[PDB]
């Protein structure tokens, strides 16, 4: 159960706080898990997806083991746009198809100044909770 | 149009009850709004009788009611010069001063004086400063208590 009044739990109110959330927040929402290799290496469960991050489809029509790189992110349609993830239209003009973060797994994070410090700070929070539970 | 045995009934709904109806779905949230005052006030005035100041034994008025007794408003004035308490001091010492009571009898005077005499004796005057002089009750009679009196100070039972 939730408890804290000063949080919602309302079929509608957080259905709403979806396709009205600003791009600020949608980052956090549009997060996908990391593959076991990284999840081991780094002590972080899931990350916000980013433009040039390498990704494996896990669910969907065209699930597979092919590591495609992300191309862009509709944070508006609120859905990502990957590499050989694509379909041929009537004219031959290939169009990519939408997939969530949530239905995808990160196989190689594209690292940075700003993204490293998150990976540190998430892994530091994880271990602080386990050291606090200890 | 009445039919065969009832009362008359002058129910008074010819005006406009409808507009000015108060329903009470505050009642329980109010209960709690209140709780938090009782609560907060006590934690704020930490060592001090939570209920409020000391208040006098007093007789109910009209003829039926005679035999009862109450917490009155405040102890009289005549009452204090007798107990040896200055009226403006009393107000700081958690002693409730009405200054508006005609004291008519020695019975209910001394009865009510004994409450002050009683109060003095079981009162720990917590001293102005920590390094303070006279009349404040000693660091033993000081350590022993942090005790708020829950419920009405020296409750008046008939």
């Amino acid at each position: 159960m939730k408890f804290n009044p000063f949080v919602t739990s309302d079929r509608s109110k957080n259905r709403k706080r979806h396709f009205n959330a600003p791009s600020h927040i949608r980052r956090k929402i549009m997060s996908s898990p990391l593959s076991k290799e990284l999840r081991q290496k780094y002590n972080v469960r899931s990350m916000p997806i980013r433009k040039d991050d390498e990704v494996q489809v896990v669910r969907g029509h065209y699930k597979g083991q092919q590591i495609g790189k992300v191309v862009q992110v509709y944070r508006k349609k609120y859905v990502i746009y990957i590499e050989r993830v694509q379909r041929e239209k009537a004219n031959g003009t290939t169009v990519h198809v939408g997939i969530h973060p949530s239905k995808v797994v990160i196989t190689r994070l594209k690292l940075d100044k700003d993204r490293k410090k998150i990976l540190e700070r998430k892994a530091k929070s994880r271990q602080v909770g386990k050291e606090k539970g200890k | 149009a009445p039919s065969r045995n009832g009362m008359i009934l002058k129910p008074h709904f010819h005006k406009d009850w409808q507009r000015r109806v108060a329903t009470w779905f505050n009642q329980p949230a109010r209960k709690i709004r209140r709780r938090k005052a009782r609560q907060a006030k006590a934690r704020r005035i930490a060592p001090r009788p939570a209920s409020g100041p000391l208040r006098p034994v007093v007789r109910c008025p009209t003829v039926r009611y005679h035999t009862k007794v109450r917490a009155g408003r405040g102890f009289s004035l005549e009452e204090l010069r007798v107990a040896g308490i200055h009226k403006k001091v009393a107000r700081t010492i958690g002693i409730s001063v009405d200054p508006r009571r005609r004291n008519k009898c020695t019975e209910s005077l001394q009865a009510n004086v004994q409450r002050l005499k009683e109060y003095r004796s079981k009162l720990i005057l917590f001293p102005r400063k920590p390094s303070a002089p006279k009349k404040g009750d000693s660091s033993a009679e000081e350590l022993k208590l942090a005790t708020q009196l829950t419920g009405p100070v020296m409750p008046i039972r008939n």
């Binding site: 159960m1 739990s9 309302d10 079929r11 509608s12 | 109806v21 329903t23």
Partner: protein, 262 residues
């Protein structure tokens, strides 16, 4: 709302105009102009007797009524007949007024709790709850009341010393203090007899809570258990005592198909 369909300014052009004598909306080059307003019968408009706020929503019971409602719920929390007959999956349970050590008030982790509910063979009620999880039939779905499930065993404890934390995530379990029992939760649906788990600490406190019988409650002001209307509740024993059987006219059970007249 008090204003429901009642914000219109419609006169009613009554009689001489065919129409219908409703109050019909004024002027306009809209469509909503000569429609009808303030009829229960009409669009916009409003209902019978606007559901008002000062309906007597809540209700009332005598203390005594609702103390010996708890009695009757508790008394039938024994008697495996009634408890089972709520689908309370008590078959491998050792005994029915199921008392447990007072170590239990002090578990602080759901894994401990769960290991208790195995070792008292009481999974299979929670198990059962745990299968009965579905989407509610109706319109409640789109109102914060989508899922539903069974009730699981009630668990009772004189003092939260960490316990209520432990038995929380486990679906179906409700905790109740002994000092603060509740008829809604012991006897859900107004049916009798839920599976309960007294912890010794609590189980002692039941007679002191609300009485033995030739002794006061000594925790409620004045309260003693209800007397029975009759003691020997089984009558089948009664009906074949020799006292009774001796003093009875002999039967009449030829039966007696009616006679066709010739």
């Amino acid at each position: 709302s008090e204003l429901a369909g009642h914000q219109t300014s419609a006169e009613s052009w009554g009689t001489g105009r065919a129409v219908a004598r409703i109050p019909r909306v004024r002027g306009g080059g809209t469509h909503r102009s000569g429609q009808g307003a303030f009829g229960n019968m009409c669009r916009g408009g409003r209902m019978f007797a606007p559901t008002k706020t000062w309906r007597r929503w809540h209700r009332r019971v005598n203390t005594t009524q609702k103390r010996y409602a708890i009695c009757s719920a508790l008394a039938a929390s024994a008697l495996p007949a009634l408890v089972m007959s709520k689908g309370h999956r008590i078959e491998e349970v050792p005994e029915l007024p199921l008392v447990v050590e007072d170590k239990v008030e002090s578990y602080k982790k759901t894994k401990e709790a769960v290991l208790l509910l195995k070792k008292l063979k009481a999974w299979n009620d929670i198990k059962k709850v745990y299968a009965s999880q579905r989407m509610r039939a109706g319109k409640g779905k789109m109102r914060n009341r989508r899922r539903i499930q069974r009730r699981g065993p009630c668990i009772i404890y004189n003092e939260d010393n960490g316990i209520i934390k432990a038995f929380r995530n486990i679906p179906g379990i409700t905790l109740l203090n002994v000092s603060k029992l509740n008829i809604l939760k012991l006897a859900p649906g107004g049916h009798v007899g839920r599976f309960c788990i007294w912890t010794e600490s609590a189980f002692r406190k039941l007679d002191e809570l609300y009485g033995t019988w030739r002794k006061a409650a000594t925790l409620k002001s004045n309260y003693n258990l209800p007397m029975h209307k009759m003691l020997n509740t089984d009558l089948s024993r009664i009906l074949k005592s020799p006292e009774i059987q001796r003093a009875l006219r002999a039967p009449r059970k030829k039966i007696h198909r009616r006679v066709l007249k010739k």
